[PDB]
Amino acid sequence: VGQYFLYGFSVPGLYECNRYPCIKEVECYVSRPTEKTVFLVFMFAVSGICVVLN
Amino acid sequence: VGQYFLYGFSVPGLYECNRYPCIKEVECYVSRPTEKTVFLVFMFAVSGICVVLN
Ligand SMILES: CC(C)CCC[C@@H](C)[C@H]1CC[C@H]2[C@@H]3CC=C4C[C@@H](OC(=O)CCC(=O)O)CC[C@]4(C)[C@H]3CC[C@]12C
Ligand SMILES: CC(C)CCC[C@@H](C)[C@H]1CC[C@H]2[C@@H]3CC=C4C[C@@H](OC(=O)CCC(=O)O)CC[C@]4(C)[C@H]3CC[C@]12C
Ligand SMILES: CCCCCCCCCCCCO[C@@H]1O[C@H](CO)[C@@H](O[C@H]2O[C@H](CO)[C@@H](O)[C@H](O)[C@H]2O)[C@H](O)[C@H]1O
Ligand SMILES: CCCCCCCCCCCCO[C@@H]1O[C@H](CO)[C@@H](O[C@H]2O[C@H](CO)[C@@H](O)[C@H](O)[C@H]2O)[C@H](O)[C@H]1O
């Protein structure tokens, strides 16, 4: 449940952030999103299989 | 009238712009605003004196 609520399914390649150091909203880029989301989906499937067995 | 409507009185030292090349709104800085606005005010005063004489 925590993994589902925290990370989700897909990893956004493009992010928009606006904190104190940055004067206005800025656009940052993430590296290798596809591999991260694929492996996250695989981990979620493995956890679901383990839950079903339990 | 054209000078009053176009430029105004004060020259903003800080500008906020958002055009097609710039993804989001960005903050640009102007150099020597005080001298520009002072000389513009002097030119406006000279034009007003000339208008009064005319
Ligand atoms: C032992 C058995 C029951 C395991 C079954 C595994 C499922 C819990 C997993 C396997 C594949 C997963 C799917 C793979 C791909 C996607 C697309 C994905 O779409 C997006 O990321 C874009 C849309 C959105 O933001 O939801 C939404 C989740 C979903 C349906 C996943 C939902 C969860 C699924 C069905
Ligand atoms: C022959 C005689 C009638 C000439 C008179 C000259 C005036 C037309 C000029 C001289 C000084 C000028 C002033 C000098 C400084 C300012 C402050 C200036 O304030 C700002 O820039 C911030 C506020 C705003 O945005 O209006 C507004 C215009 C004003 C009153 C100017 C209005 C026009 C004035 C009165
Ligand atoms: C052992 C048990 C552990 C229990 C753990 C419970 C953790 C709870 C975390 C609460 C977090 C609240 O803040 C939560 O942040 C996440 C991610 O940061 C946001 O999540 C959002 O962005 C992430 C990526 O950043 C996307 O993958 C997701 O789909 C989207 O919803 C949630 O919208 C927000 O609700
Ligand atoms: C010989 C006669 C010539 C007649 C000339 C008539 C020119 C008319 C120009 C119309 C322009 C309309 O666009 C006009 O742009 C100016 C400046 O770009 C804006 O002006 C705004 O920004 C400028 C600085 O950039 C400030 O100094 C000004 O106080 C503020 O109002 C006006 O808010 C907008 O109305």
In sequence order, what are the residues at sequence separation of 6 or more whose Cβ sits closer than 8 angstroms to the Cβ of residue A25? Answer: A16, A17, A18, B24, B25
What single DSSP character describes residue B7? T
- Whole-angstrom Cα distance, residue A10 to residue A36? 8
Q: What is the resolution of this structure in A?
A: 2.7
CB pairs under 8 A between A and B: 10
Q: Which amino acid, one-letter code, is at B52?
A: V
Give the CA dihedral A18, A19, A22, A27, nearest 10 degrees.
-30
* Contact residues, chain A, for B24 at CB < 8 Å: 24-27
Burial B36-50 (b: 16+ CB within 10 A, else e): ebeebeeeeeeeeee
Interface test with A, best of B16, B24, B27 (most A CBs within 10 A): B24
- Whole-angstrom Cα distance, residue A45 to residue A35? 15
Q: How was this structure determined?
A: cryo-EM
Q: Provide the total of helices (H) and of strands (E) in chain B, helices listed first.
A: 2, 2
* Contact residues, chain B, for A27 at CB < 8 Å: 23-24
Q: Which ligand is nearest to the CA of B17?
A: 4
Secondary element (H or E) of residue A2:
helix A2-6
